[PDB]
Amino acid sequence: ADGLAARGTFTEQLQAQRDLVKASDEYYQLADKRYRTGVDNYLTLLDAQRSLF
């Protein structure tokens, strides 16, 4: 029964954490766009990589 509970609600956690990884990934992509344009320095891009990892 506890395994059926985990199979019943771990999908609604894995989809949420995958959306979190995708949101942080496109956050890092926007921070890399800001860096390669030249607005912010390299340390904010390293903070974006810290959050994505």
Binding site: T37, G38, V39
Partner: protein
């Protein structure tokens, strides 16, 4: 006044440089305004690419 340029008693056109008053104190703020323009121009041309 540094140098008179026109020929006296001659014809002038609409916009001929007659005299040349000393620009030593009115070019040394043009460099300041040009430096501020060279900063804000690069900032605006980076934000124009970054808004897209």
């Amino acid at each position: 006044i540094l140098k008179r340029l026109f020929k006296e008693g001659s014809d002038v056109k609409a916009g001929q440089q007659l005299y040349q008053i000393d620009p030593a104190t009115y070019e040394a703020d043009y460099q300041s305004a040009q430096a501020n323009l060279a900063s804000t121009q690069e900032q605006a041309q980076r934000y124009k690419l970054l808004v897209a």
